[PDB]
Each structure stands twice: as structure tokens, then as C-alpha cells.
Symmetry: C6
């Protein structure tokens, strides 16, 4: 599920909120990802460890089918 969901967000350039386990809310677009990290683009590309993410919330409905 992870891969089609993140790929849809990536492909469609959908703004997302990535909530971290620490409660911090990151915002941007998903640039790329692998099994361990997501690169989130805003003013810079930042590397987010999946182990530190609680939830990825699209700003609008997007199909992952």
C-alpha cells in the first residue's frame, strides 16, 4: 500500500502534511522515496525517516488505485 499511495502523491504533486511521531507537522510535496526515507520538497529538499513518521495526510483526496 505504501508505494502506490506515495507514488500517487508524488506523481500528482499533491501538497501533503507529514506528521511526525514528535507531533511536528511537515508540509510540502513528495519528491521521492525509498524503503527508508521520503524526500519532501518545500524551500529545500528535506530527508524524512519513515521510522519517525506517524501519518501522511494528503491536502485533498487522491486515488491510490
Amino acid at each position: 500500500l505504501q508505494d502506490p499511495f506515495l507514488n500517487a502523491l508524488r506523481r500528482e504533486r499533491v501538497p501533503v502534511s507529514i506528521y511526525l511521531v514528535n507531533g511536528i507537522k511537515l508540509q510540502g510535496q513528495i519528491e521521492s522515496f525509498d524503503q527508508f526515507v521520503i524526500l519532501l520538497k518545500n524551500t529545500v529538499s528535506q530527508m524524512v525517516y519513515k521510522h519517525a513518521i506517524s501519518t501522511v495526510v494528503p491536502s485533498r483526496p487522491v486515488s491510490h488505485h
Copy 2:
């Protein structure tokens, strides 16, 4: 079976039972379990949000649901 987690989540998914998902930082999410895999649960309410299982403390059904 070897897994209890899988029949539990599947029953909640199949019966479209509203759940509360409490995260390790105490935040509460709500919705219906749309799908899940080894690492994540897709929780539906206004959008589908992808919740990492490693960030979940407990999944609490809003009403009794059989997982047998």
C-alpha cells in the same frame, strides 16, 4: 493463527466499523480502516491518510466486532 493482528484489522475493514487509532504521542485519529499491509494502515475519513503501524499504540473499535 500465527497472526491475530491480521484477522482483527480485516474484520474492522470488512464491517466498516468506525475506529479510534491512538498514536504513540497520544494523538487520536478516527475513521474506517480502508486497507492495511505489513507497515501501514490506510484510514478513511475526509481523505485517505496513511498511518504507520510503528506510530500506533492501540486500535479501538467503536463497538464490539468479532475477529474470530
Copy 3:
């Protein structure tokens, strides 16, 4: 057994002992251990809730129970 964890939880399950499960954020869950697998514990109170072991700090029986 091969572990302490399995006979400890099974003794609590079999004897239907009320327990407290303390989560890593500090919150206290209470109920009886219905079942468990490698990753979760099902805790019964008004509903069965699924508790991820990764989110648990301790399991405390409400009264001494032998795990031997």
C-alpha cells in the same frame, strides 16, 4: 518455554487476571489479556482493543500470578 514473555502473558490470559498495560507515552490501559501474537496484545474490556507491543512499556498484573 523459549521466552519469558510467552509464559507470562499466557498465565495472565489463562487465569483471566486483570492487568494494567502502561504505554510508552505513560498512559494506563486496563483489562484482561484475551490473546497475543508476536506483535500485538488483544486487551478485553468493553471492546477488544489491539495494543501494539512496540508501544508498551510494562504489563503489570493486578495480583501476583505464577508464570512458572
Copy 4:
């Protein structure tokens, strides 16, 4: 032994030294180490409680104890 844990915790167990186990949320537990396995430590006071190692930050003996 397959980690420094093993002799350190076994010394504390065999000598029945009171310990503090500090958890990842800052909580301090106290008791004696009854036993441990790959994933948990059983900590004895009035009851045996099961403490998941993943939730522990430190184990601190109340007085010096050789682990050699």
C-alpha cells in the same frame, strides 16, 4: 552471552541488587531483576511486572556491582 547485557543483568539478578529501570518516557521503575530474555526483563516488587527492553533507556544498580 551474546551481548554485554547478559553478564550485567545476570550479576544484578544473582546478587538480588535493587535496581532502577528508567523508561524511554522518563519513568523510573524500581525492584529486583528476577529474569530476562531476549525482549523483556521481569522486575520484582509486590508482583512480577514485565518490562519491554525497547521501552528501557537505562538500568542503574543502586550500589556498585561487578559485572566481570
Copy 5:
């Protein structure tokens, strides 16, 4: 696959970074080296940061990865 090129770009360009930990605390410095498990972050001393404790690595200015 993505961590190596991302961290190597920051290392070779000596770009100041912010490393936010799983508790939300921000460390700052330059990436000196890294392996599968840790990042060595230099400021006044070299400190060793466990990747398991990192949420996000944020360059202070855009850097191509």
C-alpha cells in the same frame, strides 16, 4: 537508496544542516561522515547521532542530491 546521495551531497558541499531528532530537538552543524547507523555532525566537537533517533535532515540552503 536515497540516503547516500543526499547525505553525501551535504557532506561534500559542507552545507550547514539541521537534524531534527525524534523528540523534535534541532541539532545543527555539518555532516562530517555517516554509515548505516550513525551520522557524525561537526560543530565544536564531533557528535555521533543515531539515525534511529533522527526524524528529518534539513539543509540550510538548497543543495542538489
Copy 6:
């Protein structure tokens, strides 16, 4: 590995360190020994610190890990 040379230099040079835990708590002492799972940190007693609970190990003064 970078961990092993870094921690071994601190151990051998008996450099006081600060170990910051994942909850932000600061421990101080000297590194007595370590393996893949724990660091034994000495002050008045030897305490066993799980590496899974550590965020950072910070030497109190510069030490070469080369």
C-alpha cells in the same frame, strides 16, 4: 562502522561524555565498554544504557576518531 572507532576513542581516552537520550535527558559519565546493544557508562556506578534509547553521544572536548 563509524560507531566503533568513535566510541573506542572516547573509551580509551577516558573522555567525559554527554549521552542524550531519545527523551532529551542528558546522562554524563565515561564510556566503560559497549557492544551492538548497550553502552556501559560509569559515574558512581556502571549503568547500562540501551543504544536504542540514545539520540546523540557528545564528547566534552574534541577527540580524534581517526
